[PDB]
């Protein structure tokens, strides 16, 4: 974590802790889909999600992002976490969590 923060600040001044907060801020989903009955060939129903889950899941996403994000490569978690936190603390489709959120959500507008 210490390292990441430094890497983030080298790559934008800013409070990297502000950067962290943002990534968590613009990551949480708005409408997540539940597995309604359907009648056999199940159809998902467009629920809204709790702020604690929003935070919970965000953190989840970004870390699974960094960890699994930069696997067999030439990078360090500190780095790939800075990458995942920077990309998400701005929004530019370069981030595995932003891509995922936008897809969970696209799915929700479908179940409406």
């Amino acid at each position: 974590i210490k390292h990441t923060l430094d890497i983030i600040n080298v790559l934008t001044d800013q409070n990297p802790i502000q950067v962290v907060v943002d990534a968590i801020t613009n990551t949480g989903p708005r409408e997540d889909t539940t597995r309604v009955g359907g009648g056999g060939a199940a159809r998902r129903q467009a629920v809204d999600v709790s702020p604690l889950r929003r935070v919970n899941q965000a953190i989840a996403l970004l870390t699974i992002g960094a960890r699994e994000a930069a696997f067999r490569n030439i990078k360090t978690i500190a780095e790939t976490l800075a990458e995942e936190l920077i990309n998400a603390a701005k929004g530019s489709s370069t981030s595995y969590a932003i891509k995922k959120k936008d897809e969970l959500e696209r799915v929700a507008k479908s179940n409406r």
């Binding site: 060939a41 199940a42 159809r43 891509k99 995922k100």
Partner: protein, 218 residues
Amino acid sequence: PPVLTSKDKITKRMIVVLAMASLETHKIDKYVLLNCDDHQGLLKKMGRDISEARPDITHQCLLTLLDSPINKAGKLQVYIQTSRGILIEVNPTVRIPRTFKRFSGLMVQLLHKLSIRSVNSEEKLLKVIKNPITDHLPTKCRKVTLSFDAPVIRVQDYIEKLDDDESICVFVGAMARGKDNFADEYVDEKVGLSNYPLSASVACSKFCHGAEDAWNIL
């Protein structure tokens, strides 16, 4: 020309999933694929699997896809999805066996060992993998089901609308008949390709052609 696999989650590409594929081994003391020619006698005796035994369709489709330019150009990967729920990834450089007899042998072996390995290389050519297909798919991927009863589309047009960083995944029912809902739970919509019913292979050429046109492949 980098080989495309599920591990890569970013590249824009076309994915075909041959859903509802009829692959099943058969004991006799040797193994073969359950198929309507050899086993129409047996199948009927049991009173089921009536056309649940059409592995040839899968075979046809595979040749059709891999033989395609879009494959040669490396912008296509295929997956299988068995009636019995088995999911296969197909390495795009695999020179699938030309005849059904030789195809059968290899699918029987793939099913028993869960992978087919190159004699010199350590990458697999075919690999049984875990459901759901939606884990292995690219992150930004449009998903559709081919269906006769769905709104007809011109594929070239259908494709030019895709975000420059967005893939396309098509589910084809690799079968003789059936409801086209083998994938309702994953897809964004269903589309038709012709006002005529097609065969799986033809649907597949049609779609490859279309991508090939739109993505500038000769």
